[PDB]
Amino acid sequence: SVGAIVSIEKAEKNFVITYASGKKAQISILNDHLFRYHLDPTGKFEEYPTPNDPKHVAKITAKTMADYGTQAFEQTNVTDSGNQFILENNGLKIIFEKESALMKVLDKKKNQVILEETAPLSFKNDKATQTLKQSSQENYFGGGTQNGRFTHKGTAIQIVNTNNWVDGGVASPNPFYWSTAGYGVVRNTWKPGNYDFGSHDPQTTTTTHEGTDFDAFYFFNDSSAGILKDYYELTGKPALMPEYGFYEAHLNAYNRDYWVKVAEGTAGAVKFEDGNFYKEYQPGDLGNLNGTLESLNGEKENYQFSARAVIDRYKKNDMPLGWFLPNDGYGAGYGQTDSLDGDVQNLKEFTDYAQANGVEVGLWTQSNLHPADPKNPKKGERDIAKEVSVAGVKALKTDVAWVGYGYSFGLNGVEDAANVFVKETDGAVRPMIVSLDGWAGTQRHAGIWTGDQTGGQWEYIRFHIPTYIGTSLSGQPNVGSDMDGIFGGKNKEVNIRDFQWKTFTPVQLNMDGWGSNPKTPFAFDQEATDLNRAYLKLKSMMMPYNYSIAKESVDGLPMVRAMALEFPNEGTAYTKDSQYQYMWGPNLLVAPIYNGNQDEAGNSIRDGIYLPDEKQVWVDLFTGEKYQGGRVLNGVKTPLWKVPVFVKDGSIIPMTNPNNNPKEIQRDQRSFLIYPNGATSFNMYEDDGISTSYEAGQSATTKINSQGPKSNEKGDLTVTIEPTKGSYKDFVDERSTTLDLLASEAPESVTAMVGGTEVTLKQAANKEEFLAGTNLYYFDKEFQVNQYLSEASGEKLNQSALSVKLAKQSVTAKDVQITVKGFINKGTVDGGNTTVDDQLTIPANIAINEEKTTPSSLTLQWDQVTEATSYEVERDGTVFGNIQTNTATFDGFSFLSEHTFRVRAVGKNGVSEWSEPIKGKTQ
Numbered sequence: 001s002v003g004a005i006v007s008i009e010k011a012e013k014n015f016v017i018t019y020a021s022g023k024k025a026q027i028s029i030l031n032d033h034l035f036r037y038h039l040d041p042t043g044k045f046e047e048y049p050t051p052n053d054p055k056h057v058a059k060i061t062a063k064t065m066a067d068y069g070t071q072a073f074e075q076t077n078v079t080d081s082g083n084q085f086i087l088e089n090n091g092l093k094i095i096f097e098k099e100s101a102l103m104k105v106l107d108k109k110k111n112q113v114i115l116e117e118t119a120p121l122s123f124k125n126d127k128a129t130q131t132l133k134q135s136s137q138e139n140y141f142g143g144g145t146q147n148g149r150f151t152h153k154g155t156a157i158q159i160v161n162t163n164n165w166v167d168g169g170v171a172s173p174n175p176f177y178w179s180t181a182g183y184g185v186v187r188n189t190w191k192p193g194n195y196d197f198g199s200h201d202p203q204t205t206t207t208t209h210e211g212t213d214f215d216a217f218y219f220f221n222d223s224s225a226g227i228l229k230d231y232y233e234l235t236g237k238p239a240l241m242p243e244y245g246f247y248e249a250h251l252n253a254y255n256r257d258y259w260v261k262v263a264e265g266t267a268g269a270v271k272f273e274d275g276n277f278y279k280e281y282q283p284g285d286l287g288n289l290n291g292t293l294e295s296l297n298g299e300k301e302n303y304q305f306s307a308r309a310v311i312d313r314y315k316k317n318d319m320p321l322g323w324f325l326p327n328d329g330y331g332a333g334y335g336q337t338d339s340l341d342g343d344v345q346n347l348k349e350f351t352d353y354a355q356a357n358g359v360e361v362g363l364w365t366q367s368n369l370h371p372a373d374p375k376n377p378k379k380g381e382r383d384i385a386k387e388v389s390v391a392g393v394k395a396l397k398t399d400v401a402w403v404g405y406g407y408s409f410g411l412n413g414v415e416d417a418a419n420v421f422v423k424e425t426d427g428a429v430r431p432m433i434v435s436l437d438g439w440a441g442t443q444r445h446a447g448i449w450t451g452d453q454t455g456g457q458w459e460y461i462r463f464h465i466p467t468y469i470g471t472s473l474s475g476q477p478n479v480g481s482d483m484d485g486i487f488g489g490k491n492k493e494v495n496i497r498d499f500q501w502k503t504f505t506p507v508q509l510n511m512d513g514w515g516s517n518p519k520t521p522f523a524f525d526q527e528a529t530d531l532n533r534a535y536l537k538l539k540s541m542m543m544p545y546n547y548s549i550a551k552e553s554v555d556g557l558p559m560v561r562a563m564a565l566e567f568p569n570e571g572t573a574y575t576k577d578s579q580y581q582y583m584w585g586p587n588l589l590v591a592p593i594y595n596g597n598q599d600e601a602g603n604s605i606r607d608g609i610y611l612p613d614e615k616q617v618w619v620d621l622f623t624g625e626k627y628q629g630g631r632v633l634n635g636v637k638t639p640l641w642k643v644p645v646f647v648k649d650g651s652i653i654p655m656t657n658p659n660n661n662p663k664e665i666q667r668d669q670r671s672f673l674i675y676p677n678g679a680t681s682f683n684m685y686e687d688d689g690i691s692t693s694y695e696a697g698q699s700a701t702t703k704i705n706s707q708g709p710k711s712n713e714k715g716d717l718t719v720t721i722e723p724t725k726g727s728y729k730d731f732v733d734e735r736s737t738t739l740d741l742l743a744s745e746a747p748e749s750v751t752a753m754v755g756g757t758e759v760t761l762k763q764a765a766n767k768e769e770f771l772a773g774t775n776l777y778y779f780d781k782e783f784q785v786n787q788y789l790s791e792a793s794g795e796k797l798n799q800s801a802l803s804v805k806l807a808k809q810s811v812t813a814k815d816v817q818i819t820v821k822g823f824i825n826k827g828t829v830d831g832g833n834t835t836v837d838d839q840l841t842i843p844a845n846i847a848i849n850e851e852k853t854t855p856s857s858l859t860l861q862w863d864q865v866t867e868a869t870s871y872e873v874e875r876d877g878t879v880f881g882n883i884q885t886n887t888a889t890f891d892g893f894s895f896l897s898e899h900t901f902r903v904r905a906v907g908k909n910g911v912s913e914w915s916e917p918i919k920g921k922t923q
Contacts, residue, residue, distance in 0.1 A: 001123055002039065005098050008078050008085040013070070015078055015087060019101060025214075029076045030068035032091045033221060034230060036188070037103070039121060039214040049215060051190050051408035058408070058415035060188060060440045062236030092220060107182060107220060114181045114220055118204060121214050128189075128214040132205045134198045138181050139574045140205070141473040141562070143195060144174030144438065145448055148463040150470035150562060151574060152177070152197045159193040159209070161406025161437050165451025167463035172438040172448045173406070174474045175209065176231060180564075180574065184227040186234060186440050188215040190407040224565050225556050231475045236444025237554050238477050239418075241506065242394070243662040243689035244360050245432050245447075246546050247322025248483065248508040248536060250314065250520070251362070251397070253332035254307035257282055257513075258291025270518060272304045280513070295336060296326050296350040307350055310512075310520075311357050317522040317529060320536045320660045323395050323432070324354050325362040328513070330401065332364065333380065340377035340386070347391040355392065358661035362395030362432070363387055365417060367402040384417070388424040395432035396421065398446070403437045410437045414445040427692040434480065434507060447478025447507055455485020456494055456516060461501070462594040466579045468505060472558035477550070479560060480507020482519070489516035492524045493596070493640065497604075499532040500643035501592035503539045504584040506550070506559055527792070531641055534788035537658045541786070543665065544654035544684055549585035551685035551699075559585060567612040572878055576892060577610055577632065587651035587682075589618065591644040603637035606644055617711040617829055618646040619675055621785065624742065624799040626712075628831035631872070631881040634888065641793035649711045650677035652704050654684045655740075658788070662689050667730075668808065671738040673785065676708030676717050676825060688729045700726035702811065708823055712832075717741065717823035721816035734808045736774065737816055741823070743802035746779040748822030752806060755814025759806060774807045831881055837910035841865045843886070843903045848920040852889065858920040860901050861887040865912065868905035874914065876900055893922045 003020035008027075017025040017039075025039040038045060048059055076089040087094040093106040104116040119131035140152040143159055148167035162170040177195055178184035185207070187193060193209035219230035232238065259278035262269050269277040281291055298306025307326040314321040326347075327334040334350075335343025351361040369384040371377035387393045396417050403410040418431040433446035442448070450467055453460060464481055471479040483502065484495045499521060502508050512519035521532035539546070549559045557565050561583035563573035572578065581591040589611070597605040611618050614630025622642060626649075627633070638644055647653075653673040659665050670684075687699040703722040709715030719739055752759040752775070761777050764770035770778035783801035784790050790797045804818055843862040852859035860873055864886050871883040875890050876899050893899060898921050905912040 002041070002101060002121060005085060005096050005101050008087070008096065010078050014073070015076075017096070027087060027094065028065055029073040029087070029089065030065065030217075031072045032075070032089055034068075034217065034219045034234070035094065036065070036217050037214070038188075041123060042212060049189050049213065051412070052405065053408065056408035056412040058412040058441070060186070060411070061234055062441060062444055063233060105183070105218070105220065107222075109222070110182070115179075115183050115218065123212065123214075126210060126212065127208050128211050129206055129208040130214070130216070132207070134203055134205045135181065136202075137571075138179055139564070140177055140179055140195075140197045141470065142174065142177035142184075143170075143470070144176070144474045144476070145170060145172035145436070145450060145467060145471045145479075147171055147450065147467050150466040150473060150579060151576060152195070154198055154202065156194060156196040156199045159187075159195060161192070161404075163400070163404060163437070166453050167459070171450045171467075172436050172442070172471070172476070174438065174440055174442075174476075176235075176440055176474055177207070178224075178227045182220055182222050182227075184219045184221070184231055186217045186231065188217060189213070190439070192407075224568065228475055228557065229555055232443075232555060235441040235475070238443040238475070239431055239433075239445060239447070240550055240554050240694060241447065241478055242430055242432055243543065243547060244322035245395070245478075245507065246543060246550070247320045247540070247661060248510060248521070249323045249325065249362065249395075250310055250321060250510045250512060251325040251328050252307075252310075252512040253328050254294045254296050254305075254310075254326045255333040255336065256331060257294050258286055258289075259294070259305050260286070260289045260291045268516060273309075274304060278305075296334060296346060297353065308353050311354055311359055313520065313522065315357060315660075317533065318660070319521050319533055320540050321357075321359050322661060323360040323362050325364060325395070325397055326350060328364045328397070328511075330399075334363070337379070339379055340371065340381055340383055343379070344383070344386045344391050347387065347393070351392040358663045360394040360432075361392065362397055363393050364399060365396045365402070366399045367413065369416065369420060384420055385424055388421060394429050395434070398433065398435040400437070403435055406437045407439055410435065411439050411441055414438075414442060418445040422692055429690055430692045430694070434509070438476070443476045443478065447480065448476055449479075449507060449509055450481040452486045453482070454488035455482065455498065456488040456491035457485075458494060458595045460485050460494060461497055461592060462580070465501070465582070465592055465594060468560045469562045469579070469582050472560040473562055473565075475558075477553035477558035477560070478506050480505065480509055482509050482511040483521070484515075484519065486511040486514050486519070487516075489519075489523070492528050495524055496528050496531050496640060497593045497643070499535050501590060503535040503643075504588060504590045504645070530788070530792035534786060534792045535643075537788045538786050540659045541655050541657070542653065543656055543659070543662070544670070544686070545585065545587070548654060548683060548685045552585070561585070563610060563612060570612050572610050572632065573612060577608065577878065580608065581610060587648050587653055588621065589646040589648070591646075593638055593643060599637060601637075603639050606636040606638050607634045609633040609636050609644055611646065614834070617649040617677070617832075619649055619742070621645040621647050622789065622797050624827060626827045626829040626832070628829050628834070631831055631879050633882040634880055635882055635884055639793070641789065641795070647675050649675050650680040650706070651675045652680060652682035652706055654682065654704070667732040668734060669736050669738070670702075670811070671740065672704055672719075673740045673742075674706050674719060675742050676706045676823065677711045678709075679705070679707045681705050686728075691729065693728060697726075698728035700724050700728065700731065712824075712826040712829065714822060714824040714826075717818075717820040719816075719818045721811075723813070723815050724811040733810050733812050735811050736808050737806040739804040739818060740783065741802040741804070741820070742799060742825050743779065743823065744800050744826045745822070745824050747777075747802055747820045749820070750777040750802070750804060751819045752804070753815075753817040754806065754809055761804070770803060770805070774805050777802060777804045831906070833910040835910040836913055837907055840867055840905050840907045840910065840912040842912045842915050843868075843871065843905055846901070846903050846915045846918045848918065849887065853920065853923055855895050855923050856893050857889055857891045858893065858899060858922060859887060859889045860903065860918070860920070862903050862915070865905040865907075867907045868912075869908060870906045872904050872906060872911070874902040881906070895922060897922050
């Protein structure tokens with residue numbers, strides 16, 4: 001409708017495009033790889049889109065056009081080469097066909113067209129639609145929290161505030177997507193949209209938003225970290241949670257409801273410490289029943305029904321607990337007095353008790369942050385200034401009735417809450433805000449949780465894994481959800497499995513009061529409780545690693561990483577083959593159990609464990625068992641106690657003592673669990689854990705370096721801890737050092753230098769001597785990464801480690817260099833030998849079992865090889881392993897689709913040649 005381009009002029013601040021219709025666009029060059037295109041068919045070209053309400057002043061962008069400076073614009077030239085206008089700088093050609101008005105972008109470094117319009121912008125039907133070429137290997141990420149999904153090629157996603165918390169919904173939309181071609185796009189709009197990544201026409205991608213304006217930021221970057229850094233520079237770097245936000249929370253209402261004494265076995269009865277059974281009632285549902293009224297502090301002959309009693313239960317069950325929210329939901333409140341001040345004092349009393357137990361307090365927070373007259377409040381009004389400054393609240397959970405309108409409501413809300421919070425604390429406390437119904441920019445103020453669903457069901461796990469991955473690919477690293485759901489429950493196995501994988505995630509919410517059982521890690525039998533504790537303690541021990549990858553996520557890759565972020569050169573990493581696993585930072589591959597499939601021994605059967613990189617050894621975190629990468633493993637037997645987690649051999653994992661909250665961490669120690677493999681590194685981040693001062697340069701980093709032999713080989717190992725750089729409030733300079741070096745033999749020698757001076761090390765004679773002393777080393781074949789899990793599993797889970805302890809030293813003044821001669825960490829590698837064994841027969845008579853053919857699956861069968869201990873099947877180029885019988889089935893295929901298979905035998909001395917390829921068609 002806009003027609004041909006008649007001119008592009010370099011104006012004072014931007015390039016002005018005039019179209020034949022008389023309509024105009026402005027191209028603003030912000031940096032050498034970022035530009036804004038604004039076609040304002042109404043003609044104003046004002047810096048910011050119109051929000052949903054004129055009170056909504058929070059902006060999508062965190063950096064103004066002016067803030068980017070004029071240098072990139074000055075260094076961009078417009079030329080008129082016949083049938084095209086071209087804008088060119090050092091990195092890009094932005095090419096406009098004059099007649100068609102179509103834009104394409106050539107990346108000069110690659111000499112490739114990265115983005116190409118295939119039809120002009122369409123403004124029909126009060127919408128603004130862009131039409132782009134899609135290439136055969138082009139994949140797409142983003143769109144925010146796209147429930148159940150992360151990889152969008154061949155699908156449409158809705159960029160809509162759906163208020164839908166389950167699979168197929170959008171708990172938190174974002175008008176941000178990116179392409180593996182090497183581009184990200186933010187639509188500079190508050191209006192809902194729809195991105196169709198070739199759902200019927202595979203060569204075309206359309207992006208649509210409601211409205212009359214087309215205003216977008218395009219950023220070009222050859223790495224996924226780069227695209228996310230561009231999104232963060234534009235819309236805001238993610239907030240860094242305070243350390244306590246990495247610990248599970250407990251949330252409910254304790255100010256309003258009643259417990260009624262009922263018979264044991266009454267539908268949803270709950271047993272309490274008096275040995276009696278009770279059922280909870282909202283006051284309006286009580287009718288003629290005799291009930292005990294809840295209170296926060298349990299001061300009214302009601303202690304077992306109080307919020308304090310719940311903190312006591314987390315302590316008695318030795319469970320980590322970061323924070324506690326006691327006023328969740330409309331009408332709940334936080335006191336029972338005749339005044340706002342009386343209620344604030346009741347909440348202060350609770351916060352004092354929580355803090356005595358190392359637990360912070362959060363509040364459910366409404367759009368009304370202040371009383372109508374803050375100097376004259378009424379009972380039941382809200383006052384964030386008093387709640388923060390008098391009662392000591394540190395965390396906020398946004399009411400869905402506040403942010404639930406979506407779009408500019410949410411961003412204005414979380415910006416207001418963050419800004420008033422840090423004003424009230426004078427920057428002494430950084431924000432801890434959990435929200436949903438977000439938009440572009442939300443991450444700079446708040447994390448999200450996925451809303452309300454029913455747990456006690458495998459679907460609760462299955463849909464959540466890709467949800468978390470896609471949230472993180474959309475520039476929101478602070479993602480969480482309810483532990484085993486707000487609704488339902490009564491499924492022990494699902495409860496254990498949800499605690500297991502969420503160990504390796506940012507935000508864990510025990511969202512209690514509405515379920516089939518209480519929402520706690522101690523709601524099931526002692527086995528479930530002991531396993532849940534074992535995994536929560538592992539997360540507490542991983543806090544230095546976790547906080548380090550959190551710091552990375554402020555200006556780089558998120559904490560929950562799609563496989564493609566870490567293995568960008570493998571096609572398997574980009575597809576639904578990667579929908580149920582992720583990298584927790586760079587070092588750990590997490591492949592949760594997400595269905596009820598079991599063998600006769602009660603092991604979960606885990607199919608589709610993708611282990612990237614044919615040259616990489618992967619190490620079971622719990623057992624030390626080794627696996628070769630370059631394969632997808634089927635039929636992996638996983639006991640109830642175990643979640644499949646693999647260490648990337650070479651990993652350095654900073655650790656700390658098991659702890660129930662950040663104040664129980666020993667700040668005068670540091671510890672490193674190291675899997676040496678060639679030359680690897682880690683940057684360990686730290687700060688005061690609580691304030692805004694990290695944003696004013698108050699933090700420290702420590703570079704740890706491991707230089708050893710390749711996986712399974714013997715050689716010299718040098719571990720260097722470089723001096724700690726930086727300072728902050730209550731920085732501890734004097735620390736002892738532990739290295740736990742996974743090792744299969746005693747070394748020839750261990751020497752230590754501390755700040756260029758030798759420290760004499762003794763070999764400990766036994767473990768008791770090692771634990772008692774310092775400046776020692778000890779070769780231990782009974783090393784336990786997690787004694788809680790050893791006890792809870794009934795398995796020793798012993799590994800072999802060379803452990804080294806050095807005395808307290810200044811971590812700023814003096815480095816550490818440990819040299820180990822004759823270092824080796826050797827174990828047999830499942831799939832390690834991929835060399836052809838000439839004596840191993842090629843599996844004979846490779847056939848499709850036609851009987852078993854369905855519209856979505858194929859079954860391949862072949863003759864036994866007597867010397868084979870397993871088989872591998874190559875499915876359309878993808879090697880599947882751990883096939884323990886002479887058949888395999890492959891799922892997730894289209895109707896009437898063709899697939900190519902080869903098979904080889906695996907024996908104790910390598911593999912057979914690959915069979916000839918065979919074809920199968922789905923019905």
